[PDB]
């Protein structure tokens, strides 16, 4: 869990040594310094260097963006600050001019596309070539209110000396006035009296012949993407051919800026120094040796663990043996639990793959899941990233390893529960002389037959609800344990009240369906509800009464562990039945056809419902379990420790 991180609040003397201490720490190890009793930052040169470094860092980020690639830590850039800036600014400015060109050309093609069709229609109706002294001015009026308005305007102007070119178009109309030699002067006034001028073009062709200008615009639109595509691939080459220096500079800059922003908090206190720090005990010897060997600073100062004083400032980093470490994915993203309170990383491996096994069958899908496991294990053996268009999955080997261990747990428990269910009804219906088969009169697998919903039902669902009881009770008892540790009377009484009321209603169900033993049950139920009422009284939050129904809902909610299993299992059973049925309807050709179609339907139902199967038990852990002992209420300061990024070299 927390591995009991402990304050290492040293105190160096020499202010001129602080840069040295931090240049040590950042390459050495992790401390996650707080903001305790902070003071100034040595403004004159330190502010300047911080400014230049954050500038070059975000510049690397910006040119990486424009180059298409994302941010990545590769290698430091030790060639100097002046040289860093003078080796960034050329490449950044080159790419900036490049994207300027690209976006200008995108805009140009956009404008050409917008202007094309109306100009095209005008040109089509530009039968009268626009060379002649008597002119052809171009309006773009609508359809409905078009005719009378411009007609009356042109009549007030002259007496039918004008000519109109009306043609339907995506717009209203492509209206077009044919004007005499010098009539254009007053015709502009007339149309402005109607409210229209001539449709001016982008400007580089607002004076050319419209017919010719139409072909010009068509040609530009027909060539713009080609130019756009070529400048795009040009930018892409520029990206590829120098990206190394980009990420290198980005790394070096991030190191420097983290160092300076840390110093900003560090140059603090009422003496020549002040500092606090958080390092895990399992790293304390390493940070101590790293401080002593290189620096052997004036002095350090180590502190105790202060289990709870504020409970926020203290960071957390979940540790666990590789017996249960890979599962950390399955608890990480939901929350980070505060220091003190429990860590559910170790409980998931005990249940999740086991439940998954309880859902599917060995001969059923353990074989193919292990095939997938072999595929992914080879994928990590070559140590390559996973690249699939389904999303921005960059599954590094340090993820694929965890996944293959998780899938191994899952597939082992599925192997187990398979023979317990004797799955692939087909392969059992085909031949398993070892245990009672459907073809046998007495059909019995090793222990229980999930394909038989009559005999095994109540047993299996009672087993599922038993998983529920044990897990939920562990949750509530853990809530109470933490209310004791954290010394919160409300927490403890509420937890024990839910526990009591829940066992009360459980024994109530027992009596209501199973048996009748008064002192065993009636007294048990009475005292359970009594401790529940004692709790709601001496806690006075009284939200138990609403939530107690929800808690019984939770303990029941583990029926699905059997439900999804029954659904999928006997689905596969009936599909195999159809396969052998079609194999029997015809001959050996029918057998091949039926096996193929059964396998196809199986693959379909598999790639469909396997995600729901994978997702149920883990959501039982996510919401049925974690909600009770407290896992979404607070959130401890996540472990963001002082370090050179370097992919944690």
């Amino acid at each position: 869990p927390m591995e009991k991180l402990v304050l290492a609040g040293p105190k160096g003397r020499a202010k001129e040594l602080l840069q040295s201490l931090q240049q040590a720490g950042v390459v050495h190890l992790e401390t996650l310094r707080p903001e305790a009793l902070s003071a100034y930052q040595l403004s004159p040169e330190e502010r300047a260097e911080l400014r230049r470094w954050e500038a070059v860092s975000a510049g690397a980020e910006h040119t990486l963006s424009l180059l298409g690639l994302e941010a990545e830590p590769a290698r430091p850039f030790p060639e100097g600050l002046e040289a860093a800036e003078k080796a960034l600014s050329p490449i950044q400015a080159h790419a900036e001019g490049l994207t300027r060109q690209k976006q200008e050309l995108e805009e140009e093609l956009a404008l050409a596309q917008a202007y094309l069709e109306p100009l095209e229609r005008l040109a089509a109706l530009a039968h009268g070539l626009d060379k002649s002294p008597f002119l052809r001015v171009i309006p773009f009026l609508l359809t409905e209110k078009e005719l009378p308005l411009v007609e009356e305007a042109l009549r007030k102007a002259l007496e039918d000396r004008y000519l109109l070119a009306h043609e339907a178009y995506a717009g209203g109309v492509a209206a077009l006035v044919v004007v005499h030699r010098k009539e254009v002067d007053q015709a502009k006034a007339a149309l402005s009296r109607a409210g229209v001028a001539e449709l001016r073009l982008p400007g580089a062709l607002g004076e050319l012949p419209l017919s010719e200008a139409a072909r010009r615009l068509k040609e530009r639109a027909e060539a713009a993407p080609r130019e756009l595509s070529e400048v795009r691939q040009h930018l892409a080459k520029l990206a590829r051919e120098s990206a190394s220096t980009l990420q290198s500079l980005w790394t070096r800059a991030q190191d420097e800026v983290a160092r300076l922003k840390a110093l900003e908090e560090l140059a603090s206190g009422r003496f020549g120094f002040a500092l606090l720090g958080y390092v895990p005990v399992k790293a304390k010897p390493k940070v101590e040796e790293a401080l002593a060997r290189h620096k052997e600073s004036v002095v350090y100062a180590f502190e105790p663990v202060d289990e709870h004083h504020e409970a926020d400032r203290i960071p957390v980093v979940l540790d666990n043996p590789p017996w249960a470490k890979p599962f950390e994915l399955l608890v990480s993203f939901l929350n980070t639990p505060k220091y003190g309170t429990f860590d559910p990383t170790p409980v998931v491996p005990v249940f999740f793959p086991f439940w998954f096994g309880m859902i599917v069958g060995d001969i059923g899908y353990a074989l193919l899941f292990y095939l997938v496991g072999r595929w992914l294990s080879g994928y990590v053996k070559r140590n390559e990233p996973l690249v699939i268009d389904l999303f921005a999955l960059k599954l590094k080997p340090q993820v694929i390893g965890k996944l293959v261990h998780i899938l191994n747990w899952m597939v082992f428990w599925t192997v187990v529960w398979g023979v317990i269910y004797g799955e692939f009804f087909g392969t059992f219906l085909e031949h398993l002389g070892v245990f009672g088969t459907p073809e046998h009169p007495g059909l019995i697998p090793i222990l229980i037959h999930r394909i038989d919903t009559a005999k095994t039902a109540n047993l299996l669902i009672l087993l599922s609800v038993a998983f529920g009881v044990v897990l939920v009770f562990f949750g509530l008892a853990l809530r109470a344990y933490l209310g004791l540790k954290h010394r919160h009377m409300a927490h403890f009484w509420e937890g024990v009240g839910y526990l009591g009321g829940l066992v009360g209603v459980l024994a109530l169900a027992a009596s209501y369906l199973g048996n009748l033993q008064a002192g065993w049950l009636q007294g048990l139920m009475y005292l359970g509800f009594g401790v529940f009422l004692l709790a709601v009284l001496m806690s006075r939050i009284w939200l138990m009464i609403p939530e107690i129904f929800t808690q019984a809902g939770h303990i029941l909610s583990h029926i699905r562990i059997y439900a999804v299993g029954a659904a999928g299992g006997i689905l596969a059973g009936l599909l195999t039945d159809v396969g052998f049925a079609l194999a029997e309807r015809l001959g050996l050709l029918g057998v091949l056809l039926g096996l193929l179609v059964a396998g196809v339907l199986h693959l379909l139902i598999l790639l469909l419902t396997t995600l729901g199967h994978m997702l149920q038990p883990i959501r039982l852990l996510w919401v049925e379990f974690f909600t009770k002992f407290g896992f979404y209420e607070e959130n401890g300061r996540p472990y963001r420790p002082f370090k050179s990024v370097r992919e944690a070299q």
């Binding site: 109706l125 009268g128 002649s132 043609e167």
Partner: peptide, 22 residues
């Protein structure tokens, strides 16, 4: 668009004969 078609057809031959004769 009969007006536009007729106007274009007329003005075509009009400008043609104009540029031809004078």
């Amino acid at each position: 668009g009969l007006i536009k078609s007729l106007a274009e057809k007329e003005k075509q031959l009009l400008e043609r004969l104009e540029a031809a004769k004078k």
